[PDB]
From Swiss-Prot, chain A:
GO biological process, one term: translation
Name recorded for this polypeptide: Large ribosomal subunit protein uL16
Gene Ontology MF terms: rRNA binding; structural constituent of ribosome; tRNA binding
Subunit structure: Part of the 50S ribosomal subunit.
Pfam families cross-referenced by the UniProt entry: Ribosomal_L16
Organism listed in the record: Mycoplasma pneumoniae (strain ATCC 29342 / M129 / Subtype 1) (Mycoplasmoides pneumoniae)
GO cellular component: cytosolic large ribosomal subunit
This protein's encoding gene: rplP
HAMAP family linked to this entry: Ribosomal_uL16
Family matches, as Gene3D superfamilies: Ribosomal protein L10e/L16
Record family assignment: Belongs to the universal ribosomal protein uL16 family.
From Swiss-Prot, chain C:
Record's subunit section: Part of the 50S ribosomal subunit; part of the 5S rRNA/L5/L18/L25 subcomplex. Contacts the 5S rRNA and the P site tRNA. Forms a bridge to the 30S subunit in the 70S ribosome.
Function in brief: This is one of the proteins that bind and probably mediate the attachment of the 5S RNA into the large ribosomal subunit, where it forms part of the central protuberance. In the 70S ribosome it contacts protein S13 of the 30S subunit (bridge B1b), connecting the 2 subunits; this bridge is implicated in subunit movement. Contacts the P site tRNA; the 5S rRNA and some of its associated proteins might help stabilize positioning of ribosome-bound tRNAs.
Family assignment from sequence similarity: Belongs to the universal ribosomal protein uL5 family.
UniProt keyword annotation of Ribonucleoprotein present: yes
Ranges annotated as spanning the membrane: none
Keywords, comma-separated and alphabetical: Ribonucleoprotein, Ribosomal protein, RNA-binding, rRNA-binding, tRNA-binding
Gene symbol of the encoding locus: rplE
UniProt xrefs under InterPro entries: Ribosomal_uL5, Ribosomal_uL5_bac-type, Ribosomal_uL5_C, Ribosomal_uL5_CS, Ribosomal_uL5_dom_sf, Ribosomal_uL5_N
Pfam families: Ribosomal_L5, Ribosomal_L5_C
Gene3D superfamilies: 3.30.1440.10
GO molecular function: rRNA binding; structural constituent of ribosome; tRNA binding
Identification of the protein by name: Large ribosomal subunit protein uL5
Any GO CC annotation of this UniProt entry: ribonucleoprotein complex
UniProtKB/Swiss-Prot annotation, chain E:
Job description of the protein: Binds the 23S rRNA.
Assembly: Part of the 50S ribosomal subunit.
Name by which UniProt lists this protein: Large ribosomal subunit protein bL31
Family classification: Belongs to the bacterial ribosomal protein bL31 family. Type A subfamily.
The organism's place on the tree of life at top rank: Bacteria
UniProtKB/Swiss-Prot annotation, chain F:
Domain of life assignment: Bacteria
Gene it is expressed from: rpmG1
Any one cellular-component term (Gene Ontology): ribosome
Species in which this protein is naturally found: Mycoplasma pneumoniae (strain ATCC 29342 / M129 / Subtype 1) (Mycoplasmoides pneumoniae)
Protein name: Large ribosomal subunit protein bL33A
SUPFAM superfamilies assigned: Zn-binding ribosomal proteins
Record GO terms (molecular function): structural constituent of ribosome
InterPro entries from the UniProt entry: Ribosomal_bL33, Ribosomal_bL33_CS, Ribosomal_bL33_sf, Ribosomal_zn-bd
Length: 136, 118, 175, 112, 44, 50
RNA sequence: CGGUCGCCUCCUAAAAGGUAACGGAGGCGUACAAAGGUACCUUCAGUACGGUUGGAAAUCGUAUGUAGAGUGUAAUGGUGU
RNA sequence: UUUGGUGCCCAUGUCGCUGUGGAAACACCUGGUUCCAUUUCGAACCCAGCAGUUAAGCACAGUGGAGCCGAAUGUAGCUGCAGUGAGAAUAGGAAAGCACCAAGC
RNA sequence: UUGAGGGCUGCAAUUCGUCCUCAUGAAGUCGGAAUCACUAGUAAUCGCGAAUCAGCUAUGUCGCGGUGAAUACGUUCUCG
C-alpha cells in the first residue's frame, strides 16, 4: 500500500514503542488536530480507510495533513512453525503511534465538520482519540 | 584557402579542387592573365600564388559560397511555399515524377510488405 | 622581438590607460598549455607517437601524456592508457607559440568570421581552438592520416578578464 | 592555494613534527630559513619551547655565500655546552648554502 | 636535452613585411599568403 | 590453496636459508637476493631453488 | 528429511570487556620483488565554467568545494600535507 | 612599542569585505652560463641582486557578511517517590590567544 | 541532385515548360537466380529528318543514311 518502494534490510527491529511523544507535540498545518491516547502500531489498512473516509466527508474544500507515515514494516511467520530455523517473513508495513502525539490536522472548513470527521476517523482507528483546537 | 592541391599534376585542374570554383572562372582568369599552367607539376612557384588567390577572390570564395547557398536555402525554406516544404523534407523540387525513381536522396531501398491477394 | 616590444610598450600603455598606482597591477600572461585528446583507437591508431613527435618538434619543451584519472564507460580505458598529450610552456617558447598563432595560424584559416566575444570563463581565462593540423609555420604535411586540431588557453595573475581582452586587442587579436 | 611561503610554513611544520615525534631524544633543533635576501637560523629545545640561540645577517652581517652565519651560532652552541643538535632543513633542501652551513656545523664538532 | 632549437625569420610578401623571433628550424624565411597586418578585420 | 613457495639459499656453501613467495605468472625469472649467511657469517647473494 | 559444523567484521549485546539461537547481515582459504622499507618532493571526491573530433561521464584551464575519492579487498574504525 | 620568524594551542582561531604601510627587514620582483632542477619549464626547487612595489600575499583597525560557540527556567532521561541533572531552542558571544629571539623602543 | 543568373514558348512556366551559362559532382572499378535479340549489310554501333506542334529533358515513335561483325558441329536433351 502506501509505503516506501525500497528498504535496505528485510527484517528491522520490532519497535521501541513505549513512551509518550517524540516530536509532533503540537498542531502545525491544520486547525483541528487529533491526539492519540494509546501507544501501539497501526497497519496501513486502517490508515487508508480513515484517509478515504476523511477525503469523502471533506473533499478539497478543506485540507487535512497527516503528520505520521508507515515508516516501518513488520514480519509475522505463518502457522505450523517449530521455534527456530531463521526469523519470520515480512507481511506488511506499519506505523508506530505513541500516546500523546498528533497525526491528523485539518483546516479550511468550519469547526463542526472538523469535529465530525475527527470523531469518524477516531472510531475507525483502533487508538482512542482526543481533539485539539489550533491556537497561535 | 592556400592548401588544396593534388601532388604533381596540372595546376589548371588542381585549382578546381575547391568546393565552389569550377573550370569556368579558373580557366577564364588563367587565360586572361596568361600564366601558361605547367604540365604534370603541382606548382611552379609562389611569386603569383598570392596574386592568383587575390584575383580568384574577386569572383567569389568557395567557403563563402557555402554560406551563400546555406542562406539562400534557409530563406527559400522560411517563406511559406511548396519549395520550402519540398526542400525541408529532402525531396526533388524540380517537378520530376516520383514513383520509385529519384533514389539518390532517399538512401537505401526500404520496404517490408504490401497488400496480398488470393 | 614581440616579447620585448610587449614589455616595453604595452605595460606602460595599460598603466596609463587603467589607473593602478603600481606598475605590477597590469595583467601579465603566465603560461600556455596544449592538449589534444585521443579517442579514435583503443590503444593504437598510430600509437599517438606522431602527435607527440610533432609537438616535440614544434615546442622547446618535452611532451608528456596524462593518465586516466576517471574510469571510462564508453570504452575500455582504465588505470592509464594514455590519450592525448600535455605541454605546459612559459618563457620564450610561450612567445614563439603566440607569434606563430597571431601571424600564421589565424591567417592560414580557410575562412574566419571574427572572435573574442565570449571566450571567457568569468574568472580570467581565455581559450583558442584550431581545427587544422597544418596551421602552424612548423608542421609537416606527412603526419597521421587524420587531420587533428588543438586547444590552448591563456591566463594571467588576475581575474579581471576585461583587461585581458584589452591587452590581447593590443596584441593583434580579432574583435 | 599556495603562496610559496605558507606552503613553506606547512612543510617546516610537518618536518618539525616528524623530528619531535619520531626522535624521542632530548635535543635542540637547529631550524634554518632561507629567505630571498639572506639566511636565518634559530635553535629550539623541546620540553621548554623557547629559543636557545639565533643568528642572521642583520645584527651580524649585511648579506649572504658566507659560512660565518654558522660559526657564531655554532660558538653560541658551545657557549651553551650541548653540541648535540638535530639539523632542520626548514622549507629548503640540503644543498648549496644549506650544505655550506651543515659543513660549518660539522667542523665545529656538533653532533648531528 | 631536447630537439635542436634555433631562431629563424618569417616573411609575409603579400603584406610586404618581415619579422624575426623564431620560425621553422629547417627552412629559412618561409612565406605566407596573409598575416596579421593584412588581417581582414583590422584594416580600415 | 596456491603454491608460491621457493627456497632462497646461499651459493658459497649451498644452504637452505629462507622460504619465500614470488608470483610465477608475472615472471618465471630467478631472483637473486642479498641476505645473511651463517656458514659464511656475512651478507652474500642467495639464489632461488624449488 | 532439510541447514550448519572452521576462520574473521558490524548489530543483536544491557555507553570497558565478557556474553544465545537452526538471528539479521557479510566475506575468507588471499595479493605482492611490488600494493615492501627507506629518503625526495606533491594533496581531495565533486560541481560549475571554457573548449575540433568528444557522448550526462574522455583531458586540460579557472575556481568553489571540508570529507561526500583513495589508503589491495566483505565490513568496521582511523585515514584531509 | 610594533614588525619578522617560531612553536604553543588547532575556530568564540575560520572563509569574506572596507582602508592603512613595507624606508630597515618579510614578501613579491630581476634573470637563469653556473651549485641544482623540473613526471614537462627558473612552474617549483636553487644561484646572485634589490629597479619597482603596497597593488598580490603580511599585519593592524573596523565590517556579526557567511561559518562557528553558546546563558537561565522548564523539559528528555533515569537511581530509591524525592532527588539527579540533559540535549535541542533561546539571551547572546563571535574579527584568536599564550611564550622565545631578533632591529628600530 | 542541389542553388544562382540569363534566353525562349505562350495571356499566364509555383502546382507541372523548356534551353543555356555558372556553382557541386550521388553512386558505380560489370552486377545472384533469369535470361531477350538476329545467320550479312546481319548484329553491334555514329548521326539526321517527319509526326504530334504555342510551349513540350519523348533519350518515345515512324523512317532515313554512315561504319560495320560472330557462329552454325548438330537436333539427344529447352519452347512451339
Amino acid at each position: 500500500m502506501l509505503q516506501p518502494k525500497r528498504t535496505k534490510y528485510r527484517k528491522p527491529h520490532n519497535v521501541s514503542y513505549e513512551g509518550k511523544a517524540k516530536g509532533n507535540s503540537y498542531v502545525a498545518f491544520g486547525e483541528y488536530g487529533l491526539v492519540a491516547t494509546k501507544g501501539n502500531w497501526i497497519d496501513a489498512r486502517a490508515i487508508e480507510s480513515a484517509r478515504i473516509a476523511i477525503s469523502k466527508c471533506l473533499g478539497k474544500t478543506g485540507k487535512m495533513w497527516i503528520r505520521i507515515f508507515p515508516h516501518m514494516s513488520k514480519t509475522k511467520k505463518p502457522l505450523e512453525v517449530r521455534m527456530g530455523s531463521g526469523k519470520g517473513n515480512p507481511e506488511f508495513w506499519v506505523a508506530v503511534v505513541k500516546q500523546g502525539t498528533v497525526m491528523f490536522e485539518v483546516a479550511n472548513i468550519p469547526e463542526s465538520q472538523m469535529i465530525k470527521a475527527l470523531t469518524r476517523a477516531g472510531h475507525k482507528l483502533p487508538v482512542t482519540w482526543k481533539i485539539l483546537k489550533r491556537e497561535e | 584557402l592556400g592548401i588544396d592541391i593534388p601532388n604533381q599534376k596540372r595546376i589548371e585542374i588542381a585549382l578546381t579542387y575547391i568546393f565552389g570554383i569550377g573550370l569556368s572562372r579558373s580557366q577564364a582568369i588563367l587565360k586572361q592573365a596568361n600564366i601558361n599552367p605547367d604540365k604534370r607539376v603541382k606548382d611552379l612557384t609562389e611569386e603569383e600564388f598570392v596574386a592568383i588567390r587575390n584575383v580568384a577572390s574577386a569572383y567569389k570564395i568557395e567557403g563563402d559560397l557555402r554560406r551563400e547557398i546555406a542562406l539562400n536555402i534557409k530563406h527559400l525554406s522560411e517563406i511559406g511555399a511548396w519549395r520550402g516544404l519540398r526542400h525541408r523534407k529532402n525531396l526533388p523540387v524540380r517537378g520530376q515524377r516520383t514513383r520509385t525513381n529519384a533514389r539518390t536522396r532517399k538512401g537505401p531501398r526500404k520496404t517490408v510488405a504490401n497488400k496480398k491477394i488470393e | 622581438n614581440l616579447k620585448a616590444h610587449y614589455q616595453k610598450t604595452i605595460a606602460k600603455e595599460l598603466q596609463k590607460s587603467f589607473a593602478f598606482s603600481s606598475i605590477m597591477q597590469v595583467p601579465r600572461l603566465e603560461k600556455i598549455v596544449i592538449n589534444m585528446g585521443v579517442g579514435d583507437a583503443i590503444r593504437d591508431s598510430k600509437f599517438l607517437e606522431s602527435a607527440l613527435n610533432e609537438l616535440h618538434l614544434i615546442s622547446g619543451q618535452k611532451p608528456v601524456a596524462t593518465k586516466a584519472k576517471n574510469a571510462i564507460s564508453t570504452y575500455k580505458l582504465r588505470a592509464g592508457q594514455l590519450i592525448g598529450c600535455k605541454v605546459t610552456l612559459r618563457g620564450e617558447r610561450m612567445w614563439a607559440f603566440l607569434e606563430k598563432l597571431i601571424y600564421v595560424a589565424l591567417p592560414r584559416v580557410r575562412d574566419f568570421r571574427g572572435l573574442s566575444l565570449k571566450s571567457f570563463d568569468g574568472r580570467g581565462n581565455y581559450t583558442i581552438g584550431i581545427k587544422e593540423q597544418i596551421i602552424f609555420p612548423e608542421i609537416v604535411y606527412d603526419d597521421i592520416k587524420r587531420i587533428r586540431g588543438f586547444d590552448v588557453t591563456l591566463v594571467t595573475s588576475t581575474n579581471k578578464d576585461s583587461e585581458a581582452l584589452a591587452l590581447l586587442r593590443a596584441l593583434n587579436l580579432p574583435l | 592555494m599556495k603562496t610559496r611561503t605558507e606552503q613553506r610554513r606547512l612543510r617546516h611544520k610537518r618536518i618539525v613534527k616528524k623530528i619531535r615525534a619520531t626522535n624521542h631524544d632530548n635535543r635542540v633543533v637547529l631550524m634554518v630559513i632561507k629567505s630571498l635576501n639572506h639566511i636565518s637560523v634559530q635553535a629550539w629545545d623541546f620540553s621548554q619551547n623557547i629559543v636557545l640561540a639565533s643568528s642572521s645577517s642583520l645584527a651580524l652581517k649585511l648579506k649572504n655565500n658566507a659560512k660565518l652565519v654558522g660559526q657564531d651560532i655554532a660558538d653560541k652552541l658551545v657557549k651553551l655546552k650541548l653540541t648535540n643538535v638535530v639539523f632542520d632543513t626548514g622549507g629548503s633542501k640540503y644543498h648549496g648554502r644549506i650544505a655550506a652551513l651543515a659543513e660549518a656545523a660539522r667542523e665545529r664538532g656538533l653532533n648531528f | 636535452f631536447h630537439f635542436p632549437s634555433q631562431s629563424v625569420s618569417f616573411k609575409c610578401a603579400s603584406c610586404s613585411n618581415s619579422f624575426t623571433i623564431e620560425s621553422t628550424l629547417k627552412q629559412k624565411e618561409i612565406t605566407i599568403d596573409i598575416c596579421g597586418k593584412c588581417h581582414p578585420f583590422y584594416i580600415g | 590453496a596456491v603454491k608460491r613457495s621457493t627456497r632462497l639459499g646461499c651459493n658459497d656453501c649451498r644452504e637452505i636459508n629462507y622460504l619465500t613467495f614470488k608470483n610465477v605468472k608475472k615472471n618465471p625469472e630467478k631472483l637473486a637476493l642479498n641476505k645473511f649467511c651463517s656458514r659464511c657469517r656475512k651478507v652474500v647473494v642467495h639464489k632461488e631453488v624449488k
